Design a protein around this nucleic acid. Sequence first.
RNA 1: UCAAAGUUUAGG
RNA 2: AGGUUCGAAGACGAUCAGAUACCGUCGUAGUUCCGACCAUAAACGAUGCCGACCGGCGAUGCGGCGGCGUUAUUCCCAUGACCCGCCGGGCAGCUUCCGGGAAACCAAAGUCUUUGGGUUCCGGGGGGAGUAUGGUUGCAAAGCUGAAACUUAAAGGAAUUGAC
Lengths: 71, 98, 129, 83, 218, 129, 208, 83, 23
Amino acid sequence: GKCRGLRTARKLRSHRRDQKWHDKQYKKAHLGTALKANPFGGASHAKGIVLEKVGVEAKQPNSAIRKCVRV
Amino acid sequence: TKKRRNNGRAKKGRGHVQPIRCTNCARCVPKDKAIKKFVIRNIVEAAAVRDISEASVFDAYVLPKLYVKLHYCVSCAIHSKVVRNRSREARKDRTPPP
Amino acid sequence: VRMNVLADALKSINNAEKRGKRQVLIRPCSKVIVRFLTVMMKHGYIGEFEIIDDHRAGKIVVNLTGRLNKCGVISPRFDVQLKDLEKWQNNLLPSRQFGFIVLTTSAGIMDHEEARRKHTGGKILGFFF
Amino acid sequence: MQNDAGEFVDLYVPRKCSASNRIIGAKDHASIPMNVAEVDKVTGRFNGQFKTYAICGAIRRMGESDDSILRLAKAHGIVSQNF
Amino acid sequence: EWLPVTKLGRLVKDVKIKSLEEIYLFSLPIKESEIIDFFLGAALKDEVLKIMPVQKQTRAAQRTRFKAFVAIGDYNGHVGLGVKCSKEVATAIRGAIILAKLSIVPVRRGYWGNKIGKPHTVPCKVTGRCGSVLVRLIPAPRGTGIVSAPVPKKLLLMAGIDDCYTSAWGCTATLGNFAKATFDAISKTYSYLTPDLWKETVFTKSPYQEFTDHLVKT
Amino acid sequence: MGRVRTKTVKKAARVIIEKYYTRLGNDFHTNKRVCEEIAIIPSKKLRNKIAGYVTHLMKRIQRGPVRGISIKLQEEERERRDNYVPEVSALDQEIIEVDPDTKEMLKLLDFGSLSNLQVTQPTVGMNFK
Amino acid sequence: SGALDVLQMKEEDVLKFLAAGTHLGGTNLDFQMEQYIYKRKSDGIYIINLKRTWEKLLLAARAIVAIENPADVSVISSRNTGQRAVLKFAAATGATPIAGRFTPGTFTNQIQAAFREPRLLVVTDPRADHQPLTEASYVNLPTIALCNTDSPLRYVDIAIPCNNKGAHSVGLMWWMLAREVLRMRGTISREHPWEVMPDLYFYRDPEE
Amino acid sequence: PLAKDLLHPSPEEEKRKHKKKRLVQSPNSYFMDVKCPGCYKITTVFSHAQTVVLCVGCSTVLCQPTGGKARLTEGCSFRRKQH
Amino acid sequence: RAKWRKKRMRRLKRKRRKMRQRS
RNA sequence: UCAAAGUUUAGG
RNA sequence: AGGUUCGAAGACGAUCAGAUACCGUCGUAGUUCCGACCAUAAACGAUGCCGACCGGCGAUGCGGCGGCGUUAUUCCCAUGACCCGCCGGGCAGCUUCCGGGAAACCAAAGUCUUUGGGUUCCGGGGGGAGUAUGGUUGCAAAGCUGAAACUUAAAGGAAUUGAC
Ligand SMILES: [Mg+2]
Ligand SMILES: [Mg+2]
Ligand SMILES: [Mg+2]
Ligand SMILES: [Mg+2]
Ligand SMILES: [Mg+2]
Ligand SMILES: [Mg+2]
């Protein structure tokens, strides 16, 4: 079971520390990784110039063209 | 799901057993596993027994018997119908048939 | 190993009460055990017990009366600061009406209510109701 | 049950097993209240008044009811010193 | 018209037992649904919590039949939680109501701290669980309301529990199991053996004894 | 290779015989006509069939009792033959046999009546594994 | 029971018990029944404290007597020893018998033809008469039962330690239970003997 | 079951326990005052001897110490009575 | 099959070790 | 007292 | 060092549309012994280790204790082999409304919302992936440690009715 005792604090708090990385949402937000992969460099929106109107094709159970813009 | 408390393999307190080559498929099997008929059997059988009793020299005479321990593996045991399958309840009856 | 004695004693009497016993024999014994059990007696949860001296640790036999729901123990023996005792009794007893939190103190072993009266924090031990 | 005024409340007050102080529930349908008749002393012969004992549904199914009943009798002087 | 085919029912019809509190006391099972409706005439209201449609597979397509979780309660000390499955939903609901009626139970209620007025919240922190879904009720102070999920809130209201803090864990989403858990919690509210009890019991006759001369009907 | 009687025959036959045991007999055509009068059997074929089984139970009855039927005279005969009382067996003459383990039994309850004491049997080894 | 003066042992009763052999129990002792035993003999047969038997037998009576209308003491045998005895007991006592093939749910189903809601059951052999015993836990039905060494004491509120195997002892026990429910209350002396023979209650294995 | 006087257990069910599991942990063993036939000196042997006990005159051997209680040499009587 | 996908992967790793040892 | 028997609209 | 048997590779014979496979005939490494590596398996009870308590029943293996009768050996002794007990701790079993559990099941997987005996390891939708990358170990084969982008609404367990 758990470490539980009274001068454990370190083991307890450090074990939590090591595990927090196994969380998915947290590793996203703490390894820089995703901010690097964001085109919107950690941003709510981004201005960008259109350079071709591209029809996207929808995923199977729906059939439809989705008219996107290459920015 | 775990089909049997046993695991069809009466082991328990060992963690290794010597194998057995099956007396049919030649398959390898744990000894603690594997269906095992012991077959004592009159050599001559019902048909000729009286024919040989007639035409034996030795007066009266008790014949012999043929003694064989088989070692059927699971696959083969079921095929030859040494052992049928059973309902989940009837699986837990380790008395033999008569 | 046999690490904390109190914690197995109370567990022994809680197991007994659960199966509907009349008396129950708790094996290694202590001051603390006898002080905890007496507190449980003063509020009528367990009946009058006795403490068999072998010339060693000792044993204790305790007569129950089916009033004792759960009698537990808090390891570690955290150090409750009287301010904090309200929180404990919220998240440890079943109601603001019965149940006790026995915490050892300068002043001695007792339930929380005596400790609040005597205005004396001290380390937690367990609880019963 | 009483409120702070001393006025009783709570729509009833449950029975409670004679052999475990264990409150016999609203819907414990394996319970028993068992009337056991007394006698006059000089003649035997059922004498009006009873001795009653409730038992929880748990104890019965545990298989411990008859020992517990037998113990309750011999406290109350129905039964007479089995030894 | 009611022709009671039980012993208990016959007594109730003859105004012999004055309250269903007497029936509860001796754990005599209520079998006939007329007894309960008689004793709780009005106040008793039936709220269809959910209609889950089940089904099962035939060689010939599939059989589909419905399942009506009814609760029932006086908003004043008694609640039931009947379930019934039928080929057509109205029949499931009519049967569900009757099954709730057969398993209404006397909810204890308690005070919070200061013990004044009439009991309003729950006694001790009772819990009740069923098939993963655990429901924990917690006694709460006046005017809080029922801090709870929809299903329990509707059943707890029916019990007549003005104030309650609640927790749950498990697949609460299984409405039936979540109602059945909350039911087991408020079932237990009486069977918690507080000091408030403890007093050695009296023991009385039980209607089957008292009116055995009436039941040998003359 | 076929003709079993249905339940709709068997029942009618059974119920007929309960009531009109006396009228009915061994010959078929006799009771075939009895079946007509006492019972409103619709089809002639059904009648003919009920009667046919009715003979067959009559034959069975004339040779001990049948399980699924109540003939009034047989029940009265059963009542006379299960309220028998001989000169009594639970006294078991004078001299009842007893063991030393069942002697001492009596010494605990204070007795010394006419009962012969005898054992030898050394613990054999009960059943076989 | 109160084996205090009037309803004490007497020689003539013990001698009947010994003849039937209700003391001579079985080989398999269940840990509930240990309570009601003197010893185990040679071979392996336990012996049943006949005082202890009496006391329990008397208790059962005081329970059956407290039942204020005798007809709502149900009495049951599934086995072919008690079927006659329970029938004669019910005649003697004024009870209702359920001799043979107890229909599952006579104590449940409002609906049923053979619906009954008694205040007490009196079992023969709780090992065999097990369906009614369990139904006695859906209804709030206390129980008497003639238990052997083996007989496990599930649900039985007041066990009578006997030789429920042998038909004699079975009969004898029923006849004894009848005497004392009759004697306590009814139209029997105790000083005088009883007109009814115990041979009445015994099962007749096809003989004539 | 459901009720056992743990403080007043009967001696028929204390001797049938383990030497440690009794209410007060006792021993199962004893000293014996061994006589022997020739040499009149009465030795004082312990039931579980483990040593091979030679006499005080040192002529004979008293006990061949087995696993259990020691094996006394044929004509060698003895008395418990103590403590 | 899992076992064979491991063999696949261990052979392909072996090919990658071999490519990179050319530099 | 064990031959061979692979496949199955995108078009709801 | 050795090489009977079997037998990856390989070679033929069959079977098949095909069979580089299953069946048959050969047959290398290996299969064995000695001396060095390797360090992984469904290395499984898929169940960490110590400690406590909480129901029955029969069995079995070791040690001890007690007991009337057997076999005997020779005339008792000592026996040893049976017999019926109890104790301690073993491998397991059946049994139950112990109590758990999503359950199947488990006297443990119980004594958990009435949550705290101690302490280790360890998981956090499914894939990518035990991949890449470094570091390290190995003669090697490999092992240990071990990401990410990108992808995706499920994948998964137990159990029910069907169909096959
Ligand atoms: Mg292995
Ligand atoms: Mg080949
Ligand atoms: Mg591994
Ligand atoms: Mg686990
Ligand atoms: Mg926890
Ligand atoms: Mg993941």
